[PDB]
Amino acid sequence: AIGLLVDDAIVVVENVERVMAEEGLPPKEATRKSMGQIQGALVGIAMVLS
Amino acid sequence: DRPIFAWVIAIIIMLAGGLAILKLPVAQYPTIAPPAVTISASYP
Amino acid sequence: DLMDKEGKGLIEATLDAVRMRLRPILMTSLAFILGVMPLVISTGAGSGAQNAVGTGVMGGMVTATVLAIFFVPVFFVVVRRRFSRK
Amino acid sequence: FGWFNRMFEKSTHHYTDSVGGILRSTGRYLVLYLIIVV
Amino acid sequence: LPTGVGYDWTGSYQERLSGNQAPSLYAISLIVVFLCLAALYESWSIPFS
Numbered sequence: 484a485i486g487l488l489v490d491d492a493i494v495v496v497e498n499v500e501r502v503m504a505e506e507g508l509p510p511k512e513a514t515r516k517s518m519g520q521i522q523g524a525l526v527g528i529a530m531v532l533s
Numbered sequence: 534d535r536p537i538f539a540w541v542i543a544i545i546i547m548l549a550g551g552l553a554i555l556k557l558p559v560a561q562y563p564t565i566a567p568p569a570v571t572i573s574a575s576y577p
Numbered sequence: 578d579l580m581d582k583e584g585k586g587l588i589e590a591t592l593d594a595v596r597m598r599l600r601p602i603l604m605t606s607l608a609f610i611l612g613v614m615p616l617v618i619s620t621g622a623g624s625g626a627q628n629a630v631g632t633g634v635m636g637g638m639v640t641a642t643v644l645a646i647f648f649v650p651v652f653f654v655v656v657r658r659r660f661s662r663k
Numbered sequence: 664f665g666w667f668n669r670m671f672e673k674s675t676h677h678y679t680d681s682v683g684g685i686l687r688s689t690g691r692y693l694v695l696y697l698i699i700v701v
Numbered sequence: 702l703p704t705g706v707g708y709d710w711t712g713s714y715q716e717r718l719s720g721n722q723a724p725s726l727y728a729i730s731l732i733v734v735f736l737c738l739a740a741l742y743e744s745w746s747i748p749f750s
Contacts, residue, residue: 600674
């Protein structure tokens with residue numbers, strides 16, 4: 484488990500870290516429109532790792 | 534609305550349902566009589 | 578998402594994508610390989626079952642990134658399957 | 664640090680340029696994929 | 702063997718694991734993986750990748 488778990492924790496986290504440099508931007512709305520790109524995949528890997 | 538996402542839901546049922554046909558009793562009328570036990574001795 | 582909402586990128590969308598996300602593929606995978614490390618060796622008497630597990634994932638993570646991020650599909654794929662026709 | 668400077672090199676060159684290099688070819692690396700299945 | 706001598710397998714197992722089973726399970730495991738990679742994707746190209 485541990486593996487396929489920090490894996491899922493790593494994406495969300497570091498995908499913010501790009502947006503805070505790729506378009507220099509800390510805020511809440513970087514977090515928000517980062518899972519504009521990420522959320523779509525998140526609930527599909529959920530349904531096939533299943 | 535959108536085709537795919539719905540069609541995928543319908544193909545779960547293509548399995549699941551048909552899978553139960555390969556895995557659930559095919560037999561007659563179900564149980565109905567209130568179930569009873571029978572003792573039986575014999576003095577020859 | 579790039580091919581869509583943004584622009585086509587016939588081959589410059591698949592390219593533009595890993596141009597911004599090789600990071601998490603090798604951040605996860607490297608962190609995974611190392612978490613599996615204590616089972617493959619290190620321990621070797623409490624549970625020999627640990628060897629049976631971790632041996633067949635270091636194997637299939639070495640060859641699930643150094644390959645998938647590269648050489649053989651996961652780039653290559655979408656090219657011919659999505660494009661090349663319809 | 665080097666560390667960072669390092670990472671942005673491989674990623675940008677090196678990998679992503681040699682990714683334009685792979686994508687250019689195709690019939691060779693498919694012949695390699697099927698050889699992998701063998 | 703001679704007459705009045707049959708056999709029966711005591712008794713190991715009733716159906717094994719990398720034998721028979723592994724197939725049927727892996728089989729369906731593909732069948733879904735494709736389906737749900739389409740419930741969020743829309744094509745006939747994405748899933749193959």
